[PDB]
Paper text:
FAH domain containing protein 1 (FAHD1) is a mammalian mitochondrial protein, displaying bifunctionality as acylpyruvate hydrolase (ApH) and oxaloacetate decarboxylase (ODx) activity. FAHD1 was identified as oxaloacetate decarboxylase (ODx), and as such acts as a regulatory enzyme in the TCA cycle; accordingly, as it was associated with the regulation of mitochondrial function.
The chemical environment of the ligand-bound mFAHD1 cavity is similar to the hFAHD1 environment. The catalytic center, defined in the human protein by amino acid residues G24, R25, H30, E33, K47, E71, E73, D102, Q109, and K123, is also found in the mouse crystal structure with residues G27, R28, H33, E36, K50, E74, E76, D105, Q112, and K126. The N-terminal ‘lid’-structure in hFAHD1 in between G24 and E33 is also present in mFAHD1. Correspondingly, human and mouse protein show similar Michaelis–Menten kinetics, and mFAHD1 displays the same bifunctionality as ODx and ApH. We find that FAHD1 displays bifunctionality as ODx and ApH in both human and mouse with comparable kinetic profiles. The catalytic mechanism and metabolic function are suggested to be identical in both organisms.
Residue numbers in the entry:
A (entry chain A), B (entry chain B): 10 to 225
Write the structure that this text describes.
Amino acid sequence: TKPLSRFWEWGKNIVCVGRNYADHVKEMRSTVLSEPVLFLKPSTAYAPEGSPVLMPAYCRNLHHEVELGVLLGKRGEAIPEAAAMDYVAGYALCLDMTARDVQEECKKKGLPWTLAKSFTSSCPVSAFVPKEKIPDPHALRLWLKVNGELRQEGKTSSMIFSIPYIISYVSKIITLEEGDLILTGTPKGVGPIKENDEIEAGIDGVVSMRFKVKRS
Amino acid sequence: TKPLSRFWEWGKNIVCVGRNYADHVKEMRSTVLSEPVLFLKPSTAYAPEGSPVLMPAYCRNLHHEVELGVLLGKRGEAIPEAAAMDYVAGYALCLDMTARDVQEECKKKGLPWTLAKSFTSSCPVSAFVPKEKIPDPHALRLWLKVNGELRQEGKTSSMIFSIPYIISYVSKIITLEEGDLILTGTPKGVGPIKENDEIEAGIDGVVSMRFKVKRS
Ligand SMILES: O=C([O-])C(=O)[O-]
Ligand SMILES: O=C([O-])C(=O)[O-]
Ligand SMILES: [Cl-]
Ligand SMILES: [Cl-]
Ligand SMILES: [Cl-]
Ligand SMILES: [Cl-]
Ligand SMILES: [Cl-]
Ligand SMILES: [K+]
Ligand SMILES: [Mg+2]
Ligand SMILES: [Mg+2]
């Protein structure tokens, strides 16, 4: 069938939320809004552990963004905030790999984030974490090291918009299918990553992952 | 499992190109770029003939965009412009349904086009057109009527970027899977549609389709 433990093989859709961590929003001097920013990645942005991250040709200034992923278990149209967790299969730790220089211009000219945010292997992804293994996803620590050295840490309690709110808020704009994934935003400390850097990230007491960076 | 005739059931990805018709680019007074603008729709934006188009709650000013769809037949990474058509399974006539008021602000504030361009049923789609049935896709007429009355017509010869160029240019930035679909842009004459409008569109001598407009 279509096994959750390898969702990235058959999962159709990826939705990402922007500006879900105050510290990160300051870090960019982009302002927080009444509702969360959404953008998409294609299914071919999945880089499962064992695949490297690939800098695009056009990418001058690649950035790491460690984010918590929410995988969905059921078709979800206008899911009520109070039902959201019924629809969640589990989680995965993700990287919202970003061409920052691209994104800067995409924002200046008022254009789609696709090149900045949506390229092949732009969503490195942990092993699948079933839901029973996380009692409370707002009580987690995310960390990311480059070459053994910590650059990003944050608590999921710091999330401006809750997960259940997001599942609800997204499912009102875009129906969500079995296997669709939502990235829930990144904390303070996003920064550059160059060719043959070695990235480690994890959720304390749940999962860790390693990704090497390559080129074209 | 994977019948091309129902690609919208199992197709994972949708890529759309912006500003591929000079007449439409003028119509907006947005400027042409060296490379085509890309944004995505999720798999749940597919509205196959028989399903209506649905105005979102937030949508104050919905617009029709008739576009030619190119469906892909095999996995496509950095497809050479000279090979592109080897990788094409067939076509579909599509609507790039757009929340224009949203898109206006998305552009002002430099934000993702997702709400403007990526919502549920934002990609109404014809029956599958096999490749045998189209000898030359740059020699086609696209038309769209609202309530019997013609609003959009154009020739696929008017395309700024060729289809083979696009298949190649996209597959350099985002790997494409069997069943992934590319919308190739809209000509002059995009405009509003309101609740319980009746849309007809077609490719002369190839296919037509009917879609009703509903709300929430
Ligand atoms: O903008 C983003 O991608 C974020 O905040 O995670
Ligand atoms: O701007 C668009 O969406 C286009 O040109 O099709
Ligand atoms: Cl960049
Ligand atoms: Cl976008
Ligand atoms: Cl290391
Ligand atoms: Cl609108
Ligand atoms: Cl033509
Ligand atoms: K997709
Ligand atoms: Mg992010
Ligand atoms: Mg369009």
